[PDB]
Design an enzyme around this catalytic site. Structure first.
Site, PDB file in Angstrom:
ATOM      1  CE1 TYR A 122      -2.536  -4.996   5.937  1.00 56.13           C
ATOM      2  CE2 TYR A 122      -4.475  -6.738   5.946  1.00 56.13           C
ATOM      3  CZ  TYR A 122      -3.445  -6.077   5.135  1.00 56.13           C
ATOM      4  OH  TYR A 122      -3.201  -6.044   3.736  1.00 56.13           O
ATOM      5  N   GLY A 127       0.460  -4.800   2.060  1.00 53.72           N
ATOM      6  CA  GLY A 127      -0.938  -4.971   1.230  1.00 53.72           C
ATOM      7  C   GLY A 127      -0.557  -6.052   0.140  1.00 53.72           C
ATOM      8  CG  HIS A 134      -1.974   0.957   0.990  1.00 55.56           C
ATOM      9  ND1 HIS A 134      -1.443   2.506   0.966  1.00 55.56           N
ATOM     10  CD2 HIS A 134      -3.402   0.898   0.840  1.00 55.56           C
ATOM     11  CE1 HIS A 134      -2.996   3.018   0.871  1.00 55.56           C
ATOM     12  NE2 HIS A 134      -3.914   2.150   0.654  1.00 55.56           N
TER      13      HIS A 134
HETATM   14  C1  LIG Z   1       0.158  -0.277   5.791  1.00 54.04           C
HETATM   15  C2  LIG Z   1       0.340  -1.640   4.875  1.00 54.04           C
HETATM   16  C3  LIG Z   1       1.197  -1.532   3.884  1.00 54.04           C
HETATM   17  O1  LIG Z   1       0.908  -2.240   2.874  1.00 54.04           O
HETATM   18  O2  LIG Z   1       2.112  -0.445   3.788  1.00 54.04           O
HETATM   19  C4  LIG Z   1       3.181  -0.421   2.958  1.00 54.04           C
HETATM   20  C5  LIG Z   1       4.163  -1.602   3.289  1.00 54.04           C
HETATM   21  N1  LIG Z   1       5.292  -1.499   2.582  1.00 54.04           N
HETATM   22  C6  LIG Z   1       6.546  -1.443   3.157  1.00 54.04           C
HETATM   23  O3  LIG Z   1       6.638  -1.349   4.462  1.00 54.04           O
HETATM   24  C7  LIG Z   1       7.688  -1.402   2.403  1.00 54.04           C
HETATM   25  C8  LIG Z   1       8.639   0.094   2.483  1.00 54.04           C
HETATM   26  N2  LIG Z   1       9.696   0.106   1.545  1.00 54.04           N
HETATM   27  C9  LIG Z   1      10.575  -0.601   1.808  1.00 54.04           C
HETATM   28  O4  LIG Z   1      10.991  -1.372   2.430  1.00 54.04           O
HETATM   29  C10 LIG Z   1      11.729  -0.304   0.793  1.00 54.04           C
HETATM   30  O5  LIG Z   1      11.409   1.095   0.263  1.00 54.04           O
HETATM   31  C11 LIG Z   1      11.846  -0.967  -0.601  1.00 54.04           C
HETATM   32  C12 LIG Z   1      12.279  -2.038  -0.138  1.00 54.04           C
HETATM   33  C13 LIG Z   1      10.418  -1.666  -0.876  1.00 54.04           C
HETATM   34  C14 LIG Z   1      13.037  -0.820  -1.654  1.00 54.04           C
HETATM   35  O6  LIG Z   1      14.020  -0.255  -1.010  1.00 54.04           O
HETATM   36  P1  LIG Z   1      14.780   0.782  -1.769  1.00 54.04           P
HETATM   37  O7  LIG Z   1      16.168   1.075  -1.149  1.00 54.04           O
HETATM   38  O8  LIG Z   1      15.273   0.131  -3.191  1.00 54.04           O
HETATM   39  O9  LIG Z   1      14.266   1.989  -2.367  1.00 54.04           O
HETATM   40  P2  LIG Z   1      13.798   3.229  -1.423  1.00 54.04           P
HETATM   41  O10 LIG Z   1      13.828   2.622   0.133  1.00 54.04           O
HETATM   42  O11 LIG Z   1      14.754   4.240  -1.428  1.00 54.04           O
HETATM   43  O12 LIG Z   1      12.224   3.862  -1.883  1.00 54.04           O
HETATM   44  C15 LIG Z   1      12.319   4.368  -2.985  1.00 54.04           C
HETATM   45  C16 LIG Z   1      11.241   5.514  -2.834  1.00 54.04           C
HETATM   46  O13 LIG Z   1      10.069   4.774  -2.828  1.00 54.04           O
HETATM   47  C17 LIG Z   1       9.176   4.973  -1.659  1.00 54.04           C
HETATM   48  N3  LIG Z   1       8.631   4.011  -1.258  1.00 54.04           N
HETATM   49  C18 LIG Z   1       8.860   2.853  -0.918  1.00 54.04           C
HETATM   50  N4  LIG Z   1       7.905   2.144  -0.578  1.00 54.04           N
HETATM   51  C19 LIG Z   1       6.809   2.820  -0.424  1.00 54.04           C
HETATM   52  C20 LIG Z   1       5.516   2.778  -0.205  1.00 54.04           C
HETATM   53  N5  LIG Z   1       4.916   1.465   0.304  1.00 54.04           N
HETATM   54  N6  LIG Z   1       4.459   3.695  -0.396  1.00 54.04           N
HETATM   55  C21 LIG Z   1       5.237   4.787  -0.379  1.00 54.04           C
HETATM   56  N7  LIG Z   1       6.299   5.119  -0.975  1.00 54.04           N
HETATM   57  C22 LIG Z   1       7.117   4.318  -0.918  1.00 54.04           C
HETATM   58  C23 LIG Z   1      10.413   5.513  -0.588  1.00 54.04           C
HETATM   59  O14 LIG Z   1       9.875   6.410   0.271  1.00 54.04           O
HETATM   60  C24 LIG Z   1      11.405   6.279  -1.592  1.00 54.04           C
HETATM   61  O15 LIG Z   1      10.844   7.624  -1.808  1.00 54.04           O
HETATM   62  P3  LIG Z   1      11.812   8.892  -2.114  1.00 54.04           P
HETATM   63  O16 LIG Z   1      12.098   8.838  -3.776  1.00 54.04           O
HETATM   64  O17 LIG Z   1      10.883   9.941  -1.953  1.00 54.04           O
HETATM   65  O18 LIG Z   1      12.984   8.810  -1.445  1.00 54.04           O
HETATM   66  S1  LIG Z   1       0.434  -2.879   6.083  1.00 54.04           S
HETATM   67  O19 LIG Z   1       0.447  -3.819   5.033  1.00 54.04           O
HETATM   68  O20 LIG Z   1       1.932  -2.461   6.316  1.00 54.04           O
HETATM   69  O21 LIG Z   1      -0.222  -2.651   7.115  1.00 54.04           O
END
Ligand SMILES: C[C@@H](C(=O)OCCNC(=O)CCNC(=O)[C@H](O)C(C)(C)COP(=O)(O)OP(=O)(O)OC[C@H]1O[C@@H](n2cnc3c(N)ncnc32)[C@H](O)[C@@H]1OP(=O)(O)O)S(=O)(=O)O
Ligand SMILES: C[C@@H](C(=O)OCCNC(=O)CCNC(=O)[C@H](O)C(C)(C)COP(=O)(O)OP(=O)(O)OC[C@H]1O[C@@H](n2cnc3c(N)ncnc32)[C@H](O)[C@@H]1OP(=O)(O)O)S(=O)(=O)O
Ligand SMILES: C[C@@H](C(=O)OCCNC(=O)CCNC(=O)[C@H](O)C(C)(C)COP(=O)(O)OP(=O)(O)OC[C@H]1O[C@@H](n2cnc3c(N)ncnc32)[C@H](O)[C@@H]1OP(=O)(O)O)S(=O)(=O)O
Ligand SMILES: C[C@@H](C(=O)OCCNC(=O)CCNC(=O)[C@H](O)C(C)(C)COP(=O)(O)OP(=O)(O)OC[C@H]1O[C@@H](n2cnc3c(N)ncnc32)[C@H](O)[C@@H]1OP(=O)(O)O)S(=O)(=O)O
Ligand SMILES: C[C@@H](C(=O)OCCNC(=O)CCNC(=O)[C@H](O)C(C)(C)COP(=O)(O)OP(=O)(O)OC[C@H]1O[C@@H](n2cnc3c(N)ncnc32)[C@H](O)[C@@H]1OP(=O)(O)O)S(=O)(=O)O
Ligand SMILES: C[C@@H](C(=O)OCCNC(=O)CCNC(=O)[C@H](O)C(C)(C)COP(=O)(O)OP(=O)(O)OC[C@H]1O[C@@H](n2cnc3c(N)ncnc32)[C@H](O)[C@@H]1OP(=O)(O)O)S(=O)(=O)O
Ligand SMILES: C[C@@H](C(=O)OCCNC(=O)CCNC(=O)[C@H](O)C(C)(C)COP(=O)(O)OP(=O)(O)OC[C@H]1O[C@@H](n2cnc3c(N)ncnc32)[C@H](O)[C@@H]1OP(=O)(O)O)S(=O)(=O)O
Ligand SMILES: C[C@@H](C(=O)OCCNC(=O)CCNC(=O)[C@H](O)C(C)(C)COP(=O)(O)OP(=O)(O)OC[C@H]1O[C@@H](n2cnc3c(N)ncnc32)[C@H](O)[C@@H]1OP(=O)(O)O)S(=O)(=O)O
EC number: 4.1.1.-
Lengths: 260, 260, 260, 260, 260, 260
Positions: free
Chosen positions: E139, E109, E65
């Site tokens: 959730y 999600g 999400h």
């Molecule tokens: C609430 C529900 C839900 O589904 O929540 C989302 C769950 N997903 C996560 O928690 C995944 C969070 N993200 C990560 O762990 C890492 O970002 C990923 C591993 C997936 C990949 O890492 P990587 O190092 O390759 O690249 P970055 O971390 O640098 O992120 C690239 C850009 O994408 C945004 N981003 C990542 N996931 C996201 C994102 N779910 N939304 C918006 N935004 C994002 C993040 O904030 C960043 O933004 P900027 O370009 O503004 O720095 S629940 O299931 O948790 O209850």
């Protein structure tokens, strides 16, 4: 053919008349076993409607559960194979309409028994009492459920918490009875309706009665909720108040309930 | 703009008047398709309340299911897509109150249809019959459930097992009707109530109606119980008695039911 | 002692009298917190029955939810730990009978509160209104369920969709009330019934009350159906109409609802 | 004795061996009636555990439903009293453990039959296929539910949507099978488990089996959901694709399914 | 034809490929609107199976999400109309099988979304995490229910309470995945299975899929238990910890949760 | 502190070590009352995860229900307020994760107790058995349901009907255990996971745990089905076989069961 009932069939209608007046048609095992055998014997294609009745001029339709046969040991008074629990299941599953034709007073388990039947037609002088709180009995879930499909919850709680008799007029007004008639019209009224029902489609009646039965039962709960309720009922049938309820009836005195 | 209904809009109230008098407003597919189209067209924000009515002076509000469209031998007559089943679901899911305003006699499926609506306001001369046991029809679970939310079980079983008409006065006493009025006042009384409802908060009305719908349907059972009931229903709609019921009606003679 | 209720005990009967007349016994947090404390203090073995009443001569029994305490918008007004939701759960789970003894007019949440009690005895001059559609309030599932165990669905839908008051006589007829008596006799009649109940078996009363509570709640649904309803409720408490309902009440003018 | 099964008893263990190899132990009415009679005859206190098996060396354990006996057109092929539906109920309600001992390939209804038994022990060379999507059959709710208590939903959908056989090794890994043994050890392995179970308390086994059966069935739904699914099933068993599946199987050609 | 997805058709299989790499295929409202439109467009007789995939070589299948679209506090983050709730309902109701073909890491999600699909076939390097305890998100019941139909409760609790990624090999062993293959073989293995499913009876597949859906949902509870859960969820989305979880993500730091 | 447990707190993790080795940590009332008090005392914001363990080096994790305390008369051994029934409810309702860290052999009620906990990490030498069919015990519905959320029905039936021990490796393969590790790594592995969980959002963990608990319990049945099962259980705990199972255990001999 039965010691404790008399059966008369004319055309497609059978009348089962209680023959246990020396015990006020109390629901003893031997009386209930005869009533069930009589019903089983009438489960035949040429029988289309059953009437249950006490003899003409009865003061007491049924005195309800035989208090002598209530277990005073440590066992549940209203377990699944108790005679009252067996006959209400049998009435409700029986593929023909069963009409309770009531003259006299109706008590406790016998009130549940007529509420389990399909229609109730009553004399204007009949009276109805639900008695467990008089005896300290933890009435069971199926038995209470059988009392909830006609009158509303507030009326049901008044009947149970007060154990006070209600008139036929009140039982009609709150939805428990189909019809109230003068006692000299009761048999003629009831036979007219039973013989009318017996000309209708019996397979349609049987499946619709079974659908109502299943819909009526379909208030479901999880295992924990039932086990919690069973624990509460056991605390009651283990209580000093339950022993006091039975003892007081058999000693012909008023119980002194203390909440233990 | 419909062949079989006439729609009038008065501010926030819509009146749907049946226009199928040559067939006594029987619930034919073509009639029900027009009724459902009219309702769908009135599902707009500026409509707040619907009245369903027969024309002024009707002897017959509705003759119920069109017996000529009932399948003979082997097909379920009350399957999910049957028109009577479709219109009761649509009425119950419709996000505005639907008031049945009843002049004349109401039969079988048409009685279930007014029971599925939110309020019933009836002429003092109106009459009500539930007829499956006249024809040998195994009425379906949802349909029987729709008859159990107002009057108690004993009253519903009397209506179905006898198939005898009840008066408006009895239907009021047992909780089927909201109001009985003289036929000359019926339209004015019903429109006054509809205009009054239409001043109230429609999103609150819609959510409360839906809460009552889901609570009314929340009698749940397992798959085996439903398949067992379906097997019982099929045995009835495959029976000789079901063919005899349809035939006897169409030949204007008394059916001879034999229990197979 | 309590700021907002007065408690009297007569033998085994406790009478809880409202003392919040300056706000027409509106169900404010401070009032409900006192009522709940008083009820918890009376959960003692020497207390067998509870009466809830307004002071003798009250024009208004209770004006219902305190409209000042409803959330402004974007927040559920009937969440699980709202005072009205707490007191109805407490009344229903309380192991002694609770009798609502009603003089004066009953509004909205206060109508749900007396409906949640075991018996209602009312003055011939008392009146009853269910009011959420006046204010645009999306009443919750538990709350609506509490209104469906006495009168039929068509009756409940008229009460809710019209928000019109009904008389004590009509409330008796449809099954909402146990008894209607002249105001001069109300206290004596209610006390006599409470004293009568006080001599019956308290453990039997408590387990039967709890069996009725469980059976009454046992309308079950899947998670998706509940979440679908909660989403519809949220659309109502997010609506312009909900804000308009609140605003109209405070500004003392007729609301103009528009369906968003 | 029986025409279509052979029964051998070893102390407290009964082995029911299919004797219908000329029709690859297809579940025809005459075979199922013999299997149910053999089970009924073994419902006696001196029998503790049942083993179901095909004869030693069978390439085909069971070819499933007899496709000749499938209702040809417009009739539900898996109605409540269809033989496959009767046998699975009987297995599940039987008060002793039933072990399926599998050598050879298992198809369709025969897969649901072993899934309805209490344990499955299989040869390393046995294979398992669920086949309704090959024939266009709308498998019924009860039958589908019987496939969902061992492997997960993604695994069941793979099995049903592909109708691809799986090996014994994959069936063990995903939780369908208890044990996989070399074919020359199968009989010894199965019998030592059946003898071991036969030393344990039979009344405890019976009540625990029945508790698991009712917990397994206790996925409950309302009437409208059941009737909606029945309507969808009927559209399938009425479809041209259903005819095409049957005809293709019997004419030994690839079916051409078109989606009506 | 879509801004955020690319669709290819291979015979009767449609492959919907995510095109939102700029936000790692986070389930934004606008992405989900295109995915749902693409699904709706493919609901045609000539399409028999759908594959969902990320582009070839993706490090991230979906970041789950869109955290930026979650509310700041005091509002339900997973209400019925939320895009993640819409897409899982649409996948589950869609009358064709939907296969998730996974290359890359799956989060939150998006893990629920692939779990809501019919089959999962994954690359040997793919990984899976369930993340609400990282962000402080309550959730919802439907969402948690969607995670419980494959692996057992202990495994599901480990995944949710640790929020630790699991490998494809572990996800296969515990029952989440159907198949694990080398990334070079993933596309052709998945297409071979989708082609095979596309030769089967599509009406049979649709009704069986719908039967599995309603059996999977048929865990029922009463209104009070749902409202109790909703109250607990609201305490979480009103908490300081929920605001900390949102802030920590925005600020790219480790949250400090305190239990308020 | 506590006579029968030892508690060690490491940062936010509490390790509860059984201290009842002279009865091999059998679930006596005195031992369970101490475990429940220790758990209640740990319900504080600064505690985030609980580990339950036997002492380092234990051959027996727990010998199960105390057979000396089992109602050996003719009353229900597994009534709602039995210690094993109390501790499984408390573990399941506990708002923090509870990890069972198992070294040694686990028997009967102790197996149900670890199955009720959130995660199970076991030594490679640990063993697991479910023993009611050794003693003739009619295990209760809630207890049986607690065994059905991890492995499939066939696996659960094998464990219960054989009462045979399974290895940690088998328990891992069938989905009962999360992890199996060498005994020297057990504390390091379990604490690494507990500390990891202790960094996550506790309010999100608590509500998701409660959602799983409610979903896991939501297999509902009607009152008649519960009362029928209770009648069957009573026939078993009243049996000669139940007395034989108890006597045989006390006399260190093999029971001879006869089906009465
Ligand atoms: C609430 C529900 C839900 O589904 O929540 C989302 C769950 N997903 C996560 O928690 C995944 C969070 N993200 C990560 O762990 C890492 O970002 C990923 C591993 C997936 C990949 O890492 P990587 O190092 O390759 O690249 P970055 O971390 O640098 O992120 C690239 C850009 O994408 C945004 N981003 C990542 N996931 C996201 C994102 N779910 N939304 C918006 N935004 C994002 C993040 O904030 C960043 O933004 P900027 O370009 O503004 O720095 S629940 O299931 O948790 O209850
Ligand atoms: C447990 C359930 C139940 O159904 O319980 C029973 C509920 N029934 C009652 O409480 C009714 C109790 N009986 C009465 O109220 C009166 O006896 C009535 C009005 C029925 C009849 O009064 P009457 O003056 O005409 O003549 P007696 O009272 O003098 O009784 C005649 C003989 O029948 C016995 N009797 C009456 N009912 C009975 C009797 N249910 N059993 C055994 N025995 C009896 C009673 O004890 C007396 O016995 P003896 O011959 O030894 O003196 S529950 O619903 O309460 O939970
Ligand atoms: C199956 C379900 C259901 O709803 O079934 C239908 C239930 N309805 C009835 O049983 C009503 C039966 N009809 C009557 O009682 C009378 O026809 C009515 C009272 C409504 C009015 O009587 P009236 O004297 O004015 O004029 P007739 O009986 O003489 O009939 C006029 C013409 O309408 C036909 N008719 C009446 N009802 C009908 C009709 N539901 N269909 C087709 N056809 C009809 C009837 O067959 C006759 O046809 P012909 O002119 O060709 O002779 S269920 O609830 O029973 O399960
Ligand atoms: C939300 C649920 C609920 O219970 O909502 C509340 C439902 N209650 C009502 O709708 C009752 C509204 N009130 C009335 O109908 C009249 O106010 C009453 C009839 C009870 C009696 O009228 P009366 O002529 O005797 O004297 P007033 O109307 O002049 O009001 C006296 C003061 O009480 C305030 N008031 C009345 N009810 C109230 C009040 N529930 N709160 C705050 N405040 C009030 C009202 O606004 C006025 O305030 P001021 O001090 O500004 O004059 S739901 O079930 O509807 O969904
Ligand atoms: O008129 P009808 O009875 O159909 O609808 P109304 O809302 O118009 O009711 C008339 C008055 O009774 C009030 N009413 C509502 N509930 C009530 C109530 N339990 N008691 C007394 N009176 C009430 C309601 O507020 C209305 O007040 P107004 O005269 O100011 O319009
Ligand atoms: C409807 C439900 C169900 O259970 O349907 C049946 C599902 N069964 C199958 O799909 C099995 C189809 N059969 C096969 O795959 C093969 O026949 C096997 C592997 C079982 C046998 O292979 P083999 O080479 O040894 O020998 P044949 O195919 O050559 O067939 C031998 C004879 O048995 C008949 N046969 C096989 N299965 C059958 C048979 N279920 N009925 C009638 N008849 C048959 C088939 O029609 C052929 O008859 P003829 O001797 O007249 O040629 S559902 O689960 O699918 O919804
Ligand atoms: C009813 C439920 C239940 O949980 O039932 C109990 C299931 N448990 C068992 O069947 C395990 C029974 N115990 C054993 O088989 C052996 O004790 C094991 C293998 C666990 C350990 O054998 P070992 O030779 O090493 O050392 P002891 O037998 O000498 O036991 C040490 C002390 O604790 C007592 N003890 C062991 N288990 C026990 C004990 N379940 N109770 C009381 N007491 C005990 C035992 O009687 C002994 O006490 P004394 O020193 O006074 O003789 S259900 O799931 O079956 O339905
Ligand atoms: O060969 P199989 O394992 O099938 O033979 P049994 O089922 O008879 O049990 C093997 C032995 O392990 C014990 N056992 C039961 N549960 C258990 C348990 N969790 N751990 C260890 N050992 C157990 C059980 O008490 C039995 O003990 P005896 O050798 O005294 O007969």
């Amino acid at each position: 053919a039965y010691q404790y009932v008399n059966v008369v069939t004319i055309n497609k209608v059978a009348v089962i008349e209680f023959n246990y007046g020396r015990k006020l048609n109390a629901l003893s095992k031997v009386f209930i076993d005869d009533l069930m055998q009589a019903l089983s014997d009438l489960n035949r294609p040429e029988i289309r409607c059953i009437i249950l009745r006490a003899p003409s001029g009865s003061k007491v339709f049924s005195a309800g559960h035989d208090i002598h046969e209530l277990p005073s040991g440590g066992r549940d008074p209203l377990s699944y194979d108790d005679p009252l629990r067996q006959i209400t299941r049998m009435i409700q599953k029986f593929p023909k309409p069963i009409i309770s034709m009531v003259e006299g007073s109706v008590w406790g388990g016998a009130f549940e028994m007529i509420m389990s039947s399909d229609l109730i037609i009553a004399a204007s002088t009949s009276t109805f009492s639900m008695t467990p709180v008089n005896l300290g009995v933890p009435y069971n879930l199926v038995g209470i459920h059988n009392l909830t499909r006609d009158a509303g919850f507030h009326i049901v709680k008044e009947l149970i918490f007060t154990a006070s008799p209600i008139t036929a007029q009140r039982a009609l007004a709150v939805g428990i009875l189909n019809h109230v008639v003068e006692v000299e019209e009761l048999e003629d009224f009831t036979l007219q309706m039973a013989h009318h029902i017996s000309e209708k489609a019996p397979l349609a009646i049987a499946v619709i009665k079974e659908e109502l039965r299943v819909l009526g039962e379909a208030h479901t709960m999880n295992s924990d909720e039932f086990e919690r309720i069973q624990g509460m009922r056991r605390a009651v049938y283990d209580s000093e108040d339950y022993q006091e309820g039975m003892n007081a009836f058999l000693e012909k005195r008023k119980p002194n309930f203390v909440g233990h």
